[PDB]
Structures are given as structure tokens and as C-alpha cells.
Ligand binder design. Structure first.
Ligand code: FES
Lengths: 118, 112
């Protein structure tokens, strides 16, 4: 796919935030991967966001798209971003386990929840 | 040393093979250029795991410079000493390379 390949080749928001407002980490040995999302929160919105993957990189395209979508959104709006709406925003995705498909959205939700704990 | 060998893409390849890991979703693609009925150049591209990548690096290195006939005979078994006790989850990852190599050779053979 031109667009999915764009996100695999040139992923948006890869990295770490050193003092993050919220941090989520999820992984699953069936998917061969762990991933982390870091958020900074300003006002009531996602002011900055970064992700990184460890292991298999098959979740990179979805993670890049989800993080772009979450940037600038209210926490409440970002909590509503799902794999299914990221899937539509990539115009689908190749065959994979649903658990593997959900990693990025699950890490994003974890990071938001982490912030809320504070 | 640490960088896997033969990584990349070939534009307008003589043969192209792609196979997928249906679990994590990663793809393995192999590109071949053939001169004198030998594999003159070969590259792989994947976003998969270390087992996918390490195997692909070995299989593509083995295929380089070989006749198409010889390359078609390369199996995961030819690098089994480097893959001892690999966990069951990773077996499919290690089979991508040889499967994609065979696809690429067959792709070339279908165009003449
Ligand atoms: S290629 Fe994804 S876990 Fe091996």
C-alpha cells in the first residue's frame, strides 16, 4: 500500500518523552512485540506524543497513524480512537491476529489512563 | 557485522516474492536480479522480528551468486545450525525467507 508503506517507511512520532504526563506499555509474545506510548498533556489535550516498538515492527504503521490522529485531541476524544477507526484511516491492514492489531490503541489508552491516575 | 546482510529493495526486479506472517502481520519481500541464470543481486525488506531478519540475512547471503536451480534448493534446513531451539512462535518467522526466495525465483521463471 502506498499509504501504509509511507507509515512503515516514514513513521510519525517515533521516540521517547523524558518526563511524560502519561505512559502506556503493552505487549504480547504472540505478536513478537512490546510497545510504548508517551504523552504530554497541555490544557485538556494531547500536546505531544511518541511511540516506540521493541521486537517485531508489524505494529509500526498503525502506531504511526494512531499517534498522528491522537495529537492535539482532548483526552476524551483520544480515548475514543480505536483500532477500527485507525484501520479505516489506513484503509485496512494485512492479515493479523486481532490482539496484535489492537496494540497501538491499547498502549494509547493505557497512557491516557496513566495520566488520569495523577 | 551486526547489520544484517543484503537488506534493501531492487527497482524493477527480475523476480519478486512476498509472503506474510498471518499472526503478527509482518511481510517478507525478496527481490532478485538475475544475470547468466545466476542470482546476481538479492535484497530483502521486512518489518518483522529478529528471527525473521536473521534468517533472511542468512538465506539471501546463501543465494547470492548461485544458479537459479541451486537457489531454488535452499531451505531453512541449510541454516539450521544457526537456528537451534528457536521457540515455536518463531518458526513461521524463520520460514518467511526461503518461502519468499522461492516465490521470487518462480516469479522470474513465469516471465520467460
Ligand atoms: S515476523 Fe512478527 S513476530 Fe516474527
Amino acid at each position: 500500500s502506498k499509504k501504509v508503506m509511507e507509515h512503515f517507511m516514514n513513521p510519525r512520532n517515533v521516540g521517547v518523552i523524558d518526563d511524560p504526563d502519561g505512559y502506556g506499555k503493552v505487549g504480547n509474545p504472540v505478536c513478537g512485540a512490546l510497545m510504548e506510548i508517551f504523552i504530554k498533556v497541555g490544557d485538556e489535550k494531547i500536546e505531544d506524543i511518541k511511540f516506540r516498538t521493541f521486537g517485531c515492527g508489524a505494529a509500526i504503521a498503525t502506531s504511526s497513524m494512531i499517534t498522528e490522529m491522537a495529537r492535539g485531541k482532548s483526552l476524551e476524544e483520544a480515548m475514543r480512537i480505536t483500532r477500527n477507526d485507525v484501520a479505516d484511516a489506513l484503509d485496512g491492514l494485512p492479515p493479523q491476529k486481532m490482539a496484535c492489531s489492537n496494540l497501538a490503541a491499547d498502549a494509547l489508552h493505557a497512557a491516557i489512563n496513566d495520566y488520569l491516575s495523577k
